[PDB]
Structure formats: structure tokens, C-alpha cells
Amino acid sequence: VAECHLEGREVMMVTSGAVAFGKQKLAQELLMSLSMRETLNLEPRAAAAVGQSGLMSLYDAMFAQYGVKIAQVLVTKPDFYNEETRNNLFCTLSELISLNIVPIINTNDAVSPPMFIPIKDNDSLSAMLAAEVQADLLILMSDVDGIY
Amino acid sequence: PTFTERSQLKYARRLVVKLGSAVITREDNHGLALGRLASIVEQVAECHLEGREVMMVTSGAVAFGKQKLAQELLMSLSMRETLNLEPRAAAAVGQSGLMSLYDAMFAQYGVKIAQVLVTKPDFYNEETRNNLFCTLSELISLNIVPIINTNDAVSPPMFIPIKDNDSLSAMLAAEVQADLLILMSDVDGIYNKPPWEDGAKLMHTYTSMDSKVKAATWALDRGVSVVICNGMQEKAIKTIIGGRKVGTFFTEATESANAVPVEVMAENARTGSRQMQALTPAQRASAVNTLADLLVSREKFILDANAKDLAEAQKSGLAKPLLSRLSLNPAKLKNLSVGLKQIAEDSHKNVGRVLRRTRLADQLELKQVTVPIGVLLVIFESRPDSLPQVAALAMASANGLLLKGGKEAAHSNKALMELVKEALATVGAEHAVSLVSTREEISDLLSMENHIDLIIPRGSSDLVRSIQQQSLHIPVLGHAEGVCHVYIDRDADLEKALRIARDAKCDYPAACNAMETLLIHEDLMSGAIFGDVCNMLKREGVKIYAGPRLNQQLTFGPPAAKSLKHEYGALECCIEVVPSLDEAINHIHTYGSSHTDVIVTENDAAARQFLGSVDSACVFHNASSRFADGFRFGLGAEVGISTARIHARGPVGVEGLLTTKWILEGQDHAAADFAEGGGRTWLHETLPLD
Amino acid sequence: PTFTERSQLKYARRLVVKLGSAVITREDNHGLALGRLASIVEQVAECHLEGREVMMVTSGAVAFGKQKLAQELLMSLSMRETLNLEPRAAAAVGQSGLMSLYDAMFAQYGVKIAQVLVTKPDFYNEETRNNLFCTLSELISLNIVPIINTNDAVSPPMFIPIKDNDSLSAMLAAEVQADLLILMSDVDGIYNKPPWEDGAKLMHTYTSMDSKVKAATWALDRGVSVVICNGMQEKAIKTIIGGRKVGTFFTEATESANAVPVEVMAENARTGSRQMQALTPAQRASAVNTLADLLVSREKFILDANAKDLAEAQKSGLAKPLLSRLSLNPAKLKNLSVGLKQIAEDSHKNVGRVLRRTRLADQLELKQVTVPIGVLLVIFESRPDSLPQVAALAMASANGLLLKGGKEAAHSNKALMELVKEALATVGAEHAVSLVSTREEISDLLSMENHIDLIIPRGSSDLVRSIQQQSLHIPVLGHAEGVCHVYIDRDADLEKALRIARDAKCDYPAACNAMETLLIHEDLMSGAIFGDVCNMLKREGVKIYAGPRLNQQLTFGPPAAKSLKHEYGALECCIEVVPSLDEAINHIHTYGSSHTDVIVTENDAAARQFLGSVDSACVFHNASSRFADGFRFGLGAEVGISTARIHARGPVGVEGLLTTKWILEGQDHAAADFAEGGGRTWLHETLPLD
């Protein structure tokens, strides 16, 4: 992405997987808080918060290794019904992209996970976004080889 | 509110820290203030590696974002344009960068963080509010510092009603039911009037920026106790929780603690002075007389007052002097009754005595007369005896008096206070005397100006030095070191010098004016006197040190002396020996604190030159250093001893508590009238004062 | 050394900062002190984003490594062992972690860093040394902050000779030929004796820890100028380069600047006092007399001294008062010659006057006599006239005197100083008078204790307030605000009150005792007086404000007043009007600074009660507030005006410059002798002093 953005294009990442990272960190900081006796014999929201913070820090370091700068924009389900809010969000995204800054969008899992076009994950959000910003190409880097 | 006093904060279990947008970013807007951020993060990391539960509410993402956007915009113009910031985008950039910085700074301490971003609508859906608080609790209970901030990126709430990152802090710290809420703004606290005026005093306690005050009040009514400090002050959090006085403390105590706190009692007594000033002829003489019979008529009340107070203090057993000089007996009162009955008659013309009478022109006769000082402040130990004794001067000097001792002998103090305020209520129409003990935060009273006039430490040399190290911006009295000295001349009879050193040291070594050194002519070492003195010492068991010109002089000798300017207070006294009187002169001026010196000699030429040349507070001749008591001077009941060189030399009697004032009674005279155009000649005829 | 004065540091081009291992790590050894590290890195980043060239020499990799190794060792024991550090490895770990932290903190400012690790042998191969310095220069010239440290990992040099991270700093900063070298240790600077003693004074300048001193000396001889400060002090670098006095400055100036610097001149004059104390009978009277003819015999030298000095100052044109009251004329000297010739005769018995004569027992006759204060310090503006005038009191008060004005009128000051020190050299055998002007760092002299006694600001109300805001730990004299007041009673004749307000204000509005308010009875507003006063004002063009009870009272009226406690100093004077004399009383006590007040009235009952109740420094009756001059009091040449309530009330004449002392001439008396066992009775017979 850094080299496809140091070439003139305008990338805009939509990261998922804050919850998994948070679950790892919470497992560690829980196992490291039992009494010595118990050793001898994970709500999604908290994990989401921890994972989001740690992941943004990692992204920031990795990108600043290339001179690029990033910024995180956290949206929710209701923020796509207030038309004034939707327009403000897209004006913000455009103003950011036009300054050679890679935004990073993710659903505000910390206080209102949308899991509980209808936005239901970090995929429908990607489709809606890339349709509104009127991007050219939309890449879905899943874990499967494609479609069978 | 579970906390009321600023000393109960060491037990604060759940904190909530807020960082105003003026603490984070610098002024010239060229980056962060890593100094203040790292100081605050170090303080939080160590207040969280100690068991507490902190939860920061950071503001100032917008300022940081504006900086970053200014840079990344200026770095995107065409080279030609060079040669001649919506809040949302800046908020996003700043939030990301700031979280990264926090994460690095905290991970430098093993701690972990997590960011929770809330909005305005997320505080109306009760299910959402409950989920948020369950999340916050589950996070705090895992030893993870959350960091809350409004989601400025997509819905800044700027456009209890949450309107900023302050009302949010209040609402949060009220819902999590934290103990302490710290608002680290950029101002020093809270003033009564804006800082650019007169009267811009700092309120160290808010008794029950307008946004901060509003939120602080709302949050106080839910049990939370808030403290507002200056973020740009070093070691802010660790000294607030440390208990020391910093910033403004919001609390409720006013009805709980007392209604006689500090200030009016100064002005009340001050006005009482103005009143008591009108009680000169035999009136204040009666004021001590009405207290005379009172003390002889209320033994039972004051004895039991001290008895149970002596009783509850004896079990403590702090140290000898308090445990020895805190009791009370009707015997002492008879000693107290006889003194003030003499202080009754002697003070007939303290105030209102004429000093100068000079006529400048016809019907132009100025003069200069005595006036009381006003609101004193005498500071003493747990000794209920001096309190009604030195007050006998106050009611003899028509001047307002305050008092402060300690927690010990309290019950006797309150009783003795109702004794005297009564007498003033009997005659005086007003109590210009107010005991305000019980941790008045001695500096607090000391920091006051134009209310009190003079400080007089009474307790002991330990208490007086605490003042000298603390006292500032206010006149001070009272001895600090009683490093007396003696001298023996090469023609001085020994047996006198023996009993003198005997009397000077073996009378009351606890006194300030007790001698703590002694000198002799060097030629006298061959006069067998050295043994005779050390003989007298062992007769009383006096630990003797020695000085350089003595150490080399004697072979076996006594042990060495640490520093000639040292003091003992017990049966110890160095001995130095020097040939030259001039060296002896230089010795005192270089080591002696000019407190009290003496000579003993049989050559008057040395006497006359010794006395006149030395500059002690008082010199003597064939006498002890145990006369600095004022009473023995035939002067009267002093109130202390002066080391300074202004207004007071040694025994501060009654005159040391007065002050002068000029009046002038003209008829039609003016200043330019004195010029040759006006028929005004300057007579300056000093007429005899009546 | 290209720099000598601590104000020449703003132009330091190449710095070298060193960070002792006690600045980086905390005390309890539980992580870094991110507070101090981030403060130092912020200061360096902003002193390097300003054009300078910094180059840090960090120490303390070993301590950080020891912490990390303790952790990673305690976290590697078997669970059973839990239930009941070679320098090299710690150095490696600490170096890596510390470089990472530095890199993050600096990249927060856009700056870039690079680490250069040297050893002991790398300073002997001359080709290696030259390559190293070429590398350092090539790095610095690219706006990159290098960070040098000894390669502790594989060859710690602990086991000019490089022996630590200090000698390395000296060698480096000498080879790169830097300008300033900062050693940020953990101590406050350099003391003469170790801090746990008496005499542990901080040397603010080292005139040409033992390792630091050794390296600092060696580095000073190569042009480098070193400064040693306390790393644990906030904003250390930015205030050193800022020029302010912090830490110890190593320099060479002593022979360059002067040989009469500060301290001895105090004690020299102090000893001169001891000498001049022996010049009472017509001697110090001659001392002013030998200066009397001197001033009438050296006009040419002093006129040209001031003439060219007036001349070189006129082109500057700072402001009116200096530009107006700096010139000198033989006319002024004739005015100067007549004053001190009167000061000659009047001071015949200032020192040595008996105050008390009381006999306690047979051949036991104490007394109390006058004594000079000692080493004064009077602070004044560019006014060569007062200097030989107030000094005429010093030589009349047998007390040591210092002086400090400014750079203006300097040549006249030095000349006037050689005038007087001569007179003392003629009679006095010693000059107990020393002018030490030219930026004595007023606080420096003020910070001194037991050398000087009293401060007397002379310049103007601006100068005196600078003292009051600065002055501490030392007695102070001198007025601060001359907020005078007047009052008119409801039975007071108008035309008198007219000329009084006329005279009080239109004589010299620049005076401190010039009235800056005026009150009238409310009933008198219907007596046509209000116009008559404002009529008189416009006759002189006096800008009039008004107060609350006046503002509402009049409809058209004059403009409003900012604050009743304000002062003008020019032709401006508020007017308030109040019915109650008691309110008028309360008005002064609440607003007036008790400096100088007056009444004008035809009802004596009001007069008697007004005067006695008010507590100004001096009150009057049918007269102006323009009498506070001492000379007009028929008292003598005063030296100022006292706002305080101790030792001095209004015009400090000659008595205000003396002090008392007790002597006692016994024969064989002792303290315990007074007890009933010894035949000693207390007579206390006050005998008439001769």
C-alpha cells in the first residue's frame, strides 16, 4: 500500500480483526492476574477496545517507516442514516484523501458493535464506502483463494 | 462525598484524570509538550502500579491534528505557489497520533491501554450506557488503563448536558463512582476575581472556566470529590494525592468542621483592637483585674480542663519537655495570679505616651505618640502557662492577639480562652483575643497579609527555627540561637570565673541564653585554672569539648569539638582559649550569634574596650549569661528575645509591642505657604513634652 | 574561552549536553524517568530547531540494562524457586532500549538521531580519531543529532585519561571546538564544603564530583566554557541559554572584570564601621566637614564627571525623570554643601545616648545605649544628588554603607565615591563606604545574609516595588504606595478646603505623599462646594474621576474611577463622598495604605475622634499631605518613608538608623545568687540618666 500510494493513487484501508487481537491481549492480561494458588490447578467490547488501540499503534509505526501518515475514522450503524452525518463523513474522507493521508476505517466495536445495503460487518461497510467515494477498484483480501 | 479533608486523599482508590487541550500542546504550536505528557504519564503509571485504578480522559486531539494537517498541507503545494483545516479531519489525525504516543509512553512501564470513543447520543440509550459502563468496569478490573474521548472524527459533540471533554469527565467519574476527580487545566486553580485585577486570590477550598466550575459542582453532589490543579506544574498528581496543598479542593465541610475558621477572627480582633484602643484609663487595667479574680475563682474548671487533658496526653508519652511542662496546678495559677496582678498596675501609660513636641510655626504643633501594633500572632508549644501570661501583655498593649499551640493541652487552651474572651466580654465589649488552634496550617495564617502584623514564636528553639525557615513577607521576632559566650582576661580572678561559669551553665541548661562556650587568655593555661574549671564541670558532669588552639595545647586533653558554632542545650560546653582579646572579639563576631555575651576581668581598660566593641544583643561584666529574662532586668514581663537589629534588642518588654504615630494640629497652613511668598517661617522649637 | 558572562550564552552556536546516569533512571529503579528524559529531549529539539548544533552524550545504559535483566531473570525461575548481572550484558540491553526510546521521542519532533559508540583505544590511533571527528562533523552539518556513548557492551572503559562518560564529554567538546558544555548532574551545582555542613554555599561562578571538577577545568583551558546544572530541575537548558543564573559557571573573568567584586567590601566597610565607631566626638562631624570643603573645592572634577556623563546620557533619551534629574550644577552643590554642613553639627550625639538607667542590686547598674546598625544598603536611581546626601547620614550614623544605582550618571557616581572614600581616608583610617554599581545582580547582594542589615530603596516608587516583590530574608524599609487621603466634615469651611486640596495636589504631584483621593460629607454636596473644587481642578487641569456614592449622586458628573486603591502620580485625583465619618474611617482603613492622611474641620469632637481612630503613618489637621519630608517636620534629613508598623513611622530621621544595646556592670553577682539562699534583693530603682 505504501508503494501504491507513493505512486499517486489514493488508497483507503478498511481493517477488521480488532476483536481477535484484543482477545489475545485480554487472555494474556487475565492469565497474568490470578492468585498464585489458582495457577496451580472476554466480552467482545473490551477486547475490541484493546485491539483497536494496539492495532492502530502498529499500523502507525509500520507506515511512518515510509514517511506516510495515517488517521483512523470510526463509524457505526446509525452514522449511515443521518444524511447530514453521512455527508459530513464523506466530506471528511475526501478532505483527508486529498492531503496524501491514508485513512483507516473500522466500525466502533468498542461501544456499539454493529454485529448486533444493511451494514452488518466490515465487508458491507467496505462496499458502501467504496461505492460512495466512487472508487475505481475494491479489493477484498479474504483468506480463501477466490471463489469456487 | 467520602472525602472532606485534603489529607484523606492518600486512600483514594479510583481516580479519573482529565487533560485539558492546553496541557498537551505547546504554545507556538510546533509539536507536543512531551515534558508535561511524559510527567503525567509517569505519575499515572506509578499511581497505577500501586493498586489504584486510574482512567484518563484526554482532550486536545484537535490541536495535534491541526498541527499535522498544517504540515502535510504546506508540504503539498506546487513549487511556484511556495514562492509567494476542517475540525473533523484534524480530529482524526490527532486521535491516531496521540494514541500511538500514549501507547509507547505507557508500554515503557509495562502497562497497557485501550481507547474508548463515545459520543453525545451514546448517553441516552440506557442499554448503551449500561453496556459502556460494564465495558469500562471489565477493563479497569484487568489492570488496563482506558482512555476516553469524544468521537470528534465523525460527530463532534461541540455542535448533565455533555458539551466538551469536561462535562463528559464529570458524568463518567460520577457513574463509575470514582473517589477523586482531577481537572488538570492550565490555570493555577480558581480565583475570586479574574487574575488581571486586585483581589485575585487563589481559593484553596471551594465551599458550597465557568464550564469547569459548573461541572465540578454537579459532580460534587454525587459523592465525587474534585480537585482542580495547574497542569503546567511539576509533580502535580503525586503531590495532590500526597496530601499537600495544591489547587482548589471542592468540598462541603464548612458546616461540618467549624464556623470560626480564620479570616474574620483576625478582623474581628482587629476591630476589637479599635474598640479596645478606647479602654486606656484603668480600663485595660481592669481587664487584667477582671481576669485576675477569674483565674482565682475558676480553678476547678481549669484544673479539670487540664487534668483530663494532661491525663489523655500522659499515655502518649511523646518526649520529656511536653510530658514535663504540660500539667497544671493551683500552685501555678497562684504564680500566674501574682504576675498579671503586677502587670495590672505597671501598664497604666503604655499607649498614648508623647515622644516629641516641636512647633514648626504658630498654631502648628506636631507631636508623635504611641499606638498599638494591631493583630499579633504568637506561636507556642503545649504550655498552658504562657498563654494567659503573654496575653496579659496583649490586654496591657491594647492590641489584637492570636494564638496557636498544638493538639496537646487543647482542653486547657479552650478553657483558658473562654476565661479571657469572657473578661473582654465583661469589659471590652468585644473579644479582641481569639485562640485558633487545631491545625491552622501555620503557613496559611502566615501567608495572610495586612491582617496580622508580627510573629512571635514561643514554643522552643525548635519551633522558632521552623518559623525562620518558613517565615516570609511578614515581620518576625524571637531568638533563633542562644549561642552565648564568656571571656576571662589574663588578669581575671579565678574563683569568680569559676562560680560564673558554674552559675551561667548549671542553672537551667534548657534556656536559650544558657552559655554554650567559654574562652580564656592563653597565658592563663599556666595558672592552673584549666583544671579548676574542668574540676567544676565534673562536679556537675559537664561534657567538655575542645577547640584547635586548645587541642594542640593539651596532650591528654578532653575530646574534640565538631563546630564552634554548635549548640547543645544540655550539660555540654566547649572551651576554646585565645591570647588576643582582639581574636576573642573576632571569635564572637565570627562564631557567636550576637545573642548574649559577657566579660569577667580585673583590668578596666580591657573591660571598657570589650563591652563597647562587641555587638551582642546585651553585654555584661562580672555576671552570668542567665540574666536575659526581662523580669530580672527590672523591665517587666518580656515576650521573647531578639536576635535581629531592628526595633528590638534582647528582652522585648512592653515597649517592643507598641509603635509610634505623628499628629499635627494646624490652623490654616499649607506646604507652598512655607515658601517666601507666604509669611511662614520654620521655628522647629522643641517644646518640653508633658 | 569565547564567553565570559552568563549573558553571552544566547549566542552559543555548538552545544554538547551530557546526561548523568542519575538523571535518566528513577531512584526506586522501576523504569525510566520519562519526565526528565522528555523534558531534556524537548529542550534539545527546540534548541536544535533554532539553528544550533547539539550533540548529546548519554550515560546510564548500565542502570537501564540492570533493570531489564532483573525483570527477565525473575521471570525465568521455576515455579518452585519462586515460593521461597554482569555489567556487559546489562550494558547491551540498556543501550538498545535507550536508543529506541530516544528515537521515538525525537521523531516526535521531525528530528533524526544516530548513535556513535567509541572506546578507550579509539582515542589513540590518530587516524581513527580524525576519522571519528570527520564523521561527527559530517553528521552535525546535516541537521542530525548524534548520540555518543562508550561501548560498554564489549569493552567498558571503567576497567586526558578517558575513565567515564564525563572525561569523554570534555575531550569531545574540546575537539569539536564547541562553545558551551553542559553537565546535567543530579546535584544543584558546586558547593565550597559538602552539602551536609555549614558553609555549604552554592558557587554561582567557579573562578580559576571531583571527576566532574577535574574534567571541567581541563576542558575550560581549550576555549570550551562549561556549565554544571541540576538535571532534576525543570526547564534547565532553556533557562541556562536564556542567560538566567542557574548552576555553576566556569570562567576566567576574575582578572578581566574587577577586583572589588562583592563580599569583602561588605566586611571591609563592616570593619570600617568597627573603626568608624571609634570616631564619635566631633570626628565624624569632621568627616562630613572634610567632605564639606571637598565638595566646594572639586567642582570642576565633579561637574565634568557629570557633564560628559550627562552628555553621553542625553542622546539616549530614556524617559523624562532620568533625563530631567541627572544633570548637575555648582548651584546644586551649593545646595548640597549647605545641607551636610547642617548635618555636621546636628549629629553630635547620635550614637552613645543612654536610654535606661536602672539598678538591680548594689554595684549592679545596667543600662541601654545606642549602637550603629552596621552595613546598610540603599538603592537609588540615576540621581547623583541624593548619594552624597544620604551618605551624610551614614557618616553621621557611624554605620557601614553600600550604594547601587544604575549605568546612568555612573561617572559622577565614581567621582562622588572617590570624594567620600577620600574623606574617610583622611579621617576614618578606612573607607566604610563603597559604591558597587554596574549590575551587581541586585538579588545577589540581597541574597547575602549577616553581611548587610537593611535595605532602603531610593530611586522611585517603581524601584521600591521591585524590592518589595524581590526582598526576602532581610529587613526592608521604604514606602511602597503613597495613597494619601483627605476629608472634609459637614461643618468645614470651604475656602480652606479649597486651598488645602490645591496645595496638597498642585505642589509636586510626582511625590509619594501627594494626595490621590479626596472625601467630603454627603450633606455638603448641597453646599456648592463640589463645583468649587472641580473649579479649582480645571484651574490646574486635574483629571477627576468619581466613585460609586458620587457617580449615582451626580447626573452629568465626571467620568468613572477604575479602583479606589489606584494611584496616578500626575494631575489626577478621584473624589468620593460619604456621609458617615465612620464610613470615612472604614474607607481609609479599607483602601488607604495608611501612608498619610489628614482632616480639615471646624468641629473638634470630630477632629479628636478622627485623628485618634485612624491609623495612618501620620495624621494632620488643617494642613496638607505635602509635609511628609522630615526636613519640614523639623526632624532632620530623613532617608525615606515607612509604610510598615515596626521600628519606623513615616519620616525615618537619624534615629531610624540606630539601634540599642544593653550593658551591665556587676561586681560578683550571679543568677542563682538572686534566690533566697544568696543575699540578693531586686531593687529595680530607675535612676535618672545623665
Numbering used by the authors:
A (entry chain B): 88 to 128, 140 to 214, 228 to 259
B (entry chain C), C (entry chain A): 45 to 128, 140 to 214, 228 to 276, 295 to 776
What does the paper say about this structure?
The bifunctional enzyme Δ1-pyrroline-5-carboxylate synthase (P5CS) is vital to the synthesis of proline and ornithine, playing an essential role in human health and agriculture. The GK domain catalyzes glutamate phosphorylation, and the GPR domain catalyzes the NADPH-dependent reduction of γ-glutamyl phosphate (G5P) to glutamate-γ-semialdehyde (GSA). Our results describe the assembly mechanism of P5CS filaments, in which the GK domain forms tetramer and the GPR domain forms dimer structure, and both domains form specific interaction interfaces.
After 3D classification and 3D reconstruction, the electron density maps of the P5CSGlu, P5CSGlu/ATPγS, and P5CSMix filaments reached resolutions of 4.0 Å, 4.2 Å, and 3.6 Å, respectively. (C) When all substrates (MgSO4, ATP, NADPH, and glutamate) were added to induce the reaction, the long P5CSMix filaments were observed, which is similar to the P5CSGlu filaments. In the helical P5CS filament structure, the GK tetramers serve as the core of the filament, and the GPR dimers form left-handed double helix structures around the central axis. In P5CSGlu/ATPγS and P5CSMix filaments, the additional interface between hook structures pairs locks adjacent GK tetramers. The hook interaction forms strong contacts via hydrogen bonds (M119-R124, L121-M123) and salt bridges (E116-R124). In the P5CSGlu filament, the GK and GPR domains are likely in a stable conformational state, while vibration may occur in the GPR domain of P5CSGlu/ATPγS and P5CSMix filaments due to the binding of ligands. We propose that the interactions among the hook pairs are required for stabilizing the filament during the transformation from the P5CSGlu filament to the P5CSGlu/ ATPγS filament or P5CSMix filament.
